[PDB]
């Protein structure tokens, strides 16, 4: 569509809101212009959601527990508060790991205090101490405990800092108290920030004086990759095939030892800027470790990222990077030859959280498809700044989009594919538009790396060209 038509569609969609809601939502919809380098002049981000408009955003408890701390496998994470949250967030995110669940790994488990009315009225400090004692009694092989605070804990002023400090000192254990109450902030981003602050204060500086770890000039840490079906492993195999040594993974398949060993690395490879930029900046300022953004979504982005990473080291690393690129070229070339004809010219609309709306555009372009509209759940203005460059002319940008807005935007655009979460999958499937879950990879994956590119292409081809989408109209209607 033309630029004058996207604005008309935006106005027609906004016409249904009341005055306050319309005025607020007019600031969150924009027509892309890659020339503009400041996203503040076109879109407004990181504000509170309008009440009663069916937002897709989550809470700070999600952004901390289910995002940052949860993937850590050797730790035990306590959902301090009522049951719901832990139950709703149990095993819903596919942060893959290797370990014996119930013995030394606890990712898919749900530990909760299960607050009652008497806990609200009288407190939860004694109950928390008893819970820590029972956790240590029944799960002796855990390497740490984290306390994720749910809303009531923040409201009633339960002092989990002192309980954590006392129990950790007396039991010689690392107990990290996290104030990730849902009502804090507007979305999962503040949960990311709180979890990063907890990591900085209670975990990161534990080995500040230990010098037993021998460091090589090829030490790297993957920052912000959470192994959604093995993406972290796929990236790690490429990084290790380059001659680089990965010491830490944050936090998919990550261990507390990797977090402790991170300050000894020579370079931080940040995948998700939105979630771990604060900890990357803290490490850069305190230990002098530089950090850089890398993207392993599609062959072009992967090759560019490998070359940029190899540019940070000596000639042997560059030679190994060239060897890896040459080795992996025929496979992704064959994948393109197989799947691009079936996917050429197709239009894609995306609505994901903080990073993936701009990171996956490269793969779609590698497969011959174009992105006609992308959007962020909770991303800040810097993410949109990076997003304007990657998106073409006259493409719609939306922040904190509502179900109504997304429904009519899709109705007016008629995209060939929609990539969003589980809360819009069936809405758009019943509309006759192929849908792909861009958070869990539709229980497939991994999609990062050369190995993940083939799975990505196969999944897009099977979802887009399925015979079921041509059968939604009865022959007699």
């Amino acid at each position: 569509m033309s630029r004058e038509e996207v604005e008309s569609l935006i106005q027609e969609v906004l016409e249904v809101y009341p005055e306050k809601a319309r005025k607020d939502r007019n600031k969150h919809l924009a027509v892309n212009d890659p020339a503009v380098t400041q996203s503040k002049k076109c879109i407004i981000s990181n504000k509170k959601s309008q009440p009663g408009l069916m937002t897709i955003r989550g809470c700070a408890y999600a952004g901390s527990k289910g995002v940052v701390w949860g993937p850590i496998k050797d730790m035990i994470h306590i959902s301090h508060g009522p049951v719901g949250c832990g139950q709703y967030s149990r095993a819903g995110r596919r942060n893959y790991y290797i370990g014996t669940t119930g013995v030394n790994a606890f990712v898919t488990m749900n530990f909760t205090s299960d607050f009652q009315e008497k806990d609200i009225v009288f407190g939860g400090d004694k109950k928390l101490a008893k819970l820590i004692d029972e956790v240590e009694t029944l799960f002796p092989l855990n390497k740490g405990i984290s306390v994720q605070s749910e809303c009531p804990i923040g409201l009633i002023g339960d002092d989990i800092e002192s309980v954590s400090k006392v129990k950790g000192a007396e039991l010689s254990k690392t107990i990290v108290p996290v104030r990730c109450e849902g009502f804090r902030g507007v979305s999962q981003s503040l949960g990311h920030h709180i979890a990063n602050d907890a990591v900085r204060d209670w975990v990161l500086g534990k080995r500040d004086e230990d010098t037993t770890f021998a460091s090589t000039p090829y030490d790297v840490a993957i920052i912000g990759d959470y192994n959604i079906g093995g993406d972290a492993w796929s990236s790690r195999i490429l990084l290790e095939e380059m001659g680089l040594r990965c010491v830490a993974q944050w936090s998919g398949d990550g261990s507390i030892s990797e977090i402790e060993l991170t300050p000894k690395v020579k370079l931080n490879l940040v995948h998700c800027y939105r979630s771990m930029n604060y900890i990357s900046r803290h490490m850069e300022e305190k230990y002098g470790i530089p950090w850089m953004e890398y993207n392993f979504f599609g062959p072009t982005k992967t090759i560019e990222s490998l070359r940029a990473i190899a540019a940070k080291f000596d000639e042997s690393i560059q030679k190994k990077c060239e060897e890896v690129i040459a080795k992996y070229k025929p496979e992704w070339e064959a994948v393109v030859a197989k799947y691009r004809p079936r996917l050429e010219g197709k239009r894609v609309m995306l609505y994901i959280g903080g990073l993936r709306p701009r990171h996956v555009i490269g793969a779609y372009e590698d497969l011959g498809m174009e992105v006609v509209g992308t959007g962020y759940e909770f991303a800040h203005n810097d993410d949109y700044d990076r997003t304007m460059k990657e998106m073409g002319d006259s493409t719609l940008l939306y922040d904190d989009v509502t179900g109504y807005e997304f429904e009519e935007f899709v109705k007016r655009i008629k995209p060939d594919l929609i990539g969003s979460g589980i809360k819009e999958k069936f809405i758009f499937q019943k509309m006759g538009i192929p849908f792909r879950e861009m958070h869990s990879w539709d229980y497939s994956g991994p999609y990062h790396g050369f190995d993940g590119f083939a799975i990505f292409a196969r999944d897009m081809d099977m979802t887009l060209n399925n015979p079921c989408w041509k059968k939604l109209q009865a022959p007699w209607e």
């Binding site: 009652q116 009315e117 008497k118 609200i120 009225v121 009288f122 407190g123 400090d125 409201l155 009633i156």
Partner: protein, 271 residues
Amino acid sequence: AMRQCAIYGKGGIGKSTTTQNLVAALAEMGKKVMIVGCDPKADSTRLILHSKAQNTIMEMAAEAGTVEDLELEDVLKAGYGGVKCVESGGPEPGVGCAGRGVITAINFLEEEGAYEDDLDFVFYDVLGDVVCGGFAMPIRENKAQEIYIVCSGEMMAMYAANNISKGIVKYANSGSVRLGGLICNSRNTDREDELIIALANKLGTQMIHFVPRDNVVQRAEIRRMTVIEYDPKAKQADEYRALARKVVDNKLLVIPNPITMDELEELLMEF
């Protein structure tokens, strides 16, 4: 006639004591009055039951485990003149959430059934620092419809009364709860009576009774026996009977409207 009332004001003016002697005076000539203690300090029923503490709702809820399996008679007891007594209770200071305790205790009383007998009065006692809806539950719907503010002649009492009148605007514009009157507990202040009637007409209301700063109350509190229990022939006994009469025959109740600050500034100049 199922008259649900509540006492408001800031702490130290004497809301509790005032309602204890008020119910004691009421109980003389045949009232089935029940009092509810919404104070976590557990003193709103002290003199009537003649026992410092009893089985409060939250204590028994913690002992049993849940409110559903908690009996009504285990927490509700009768004392002088058949004054059925009950107290919400709560946590020790500095921990927990007392407003939630008040909420669950009031729900307990409402849903087991306590507003079933004659219940001439369902007097509620609240704390001065109403900082949440938990302590505003007594003035919710199907609850107290007549609020009395205990105040004296002094800047802090006027500030408390103004803030409380502001707080009884949100719950009154969407309900039937009104303001009955203002009760006076003297601080031994100069030409106070005229100042207090000036405040009463400033809010378009009337002052029910003026209670002097008598030293009998502090003597009755240490022996934890109300003035009616103390002796049926005292000066305060007759005064509290007058309070009882003017609180049972009350007919004036209007929606409070907040007033401006200039009067608070220049009240002392007028008086």
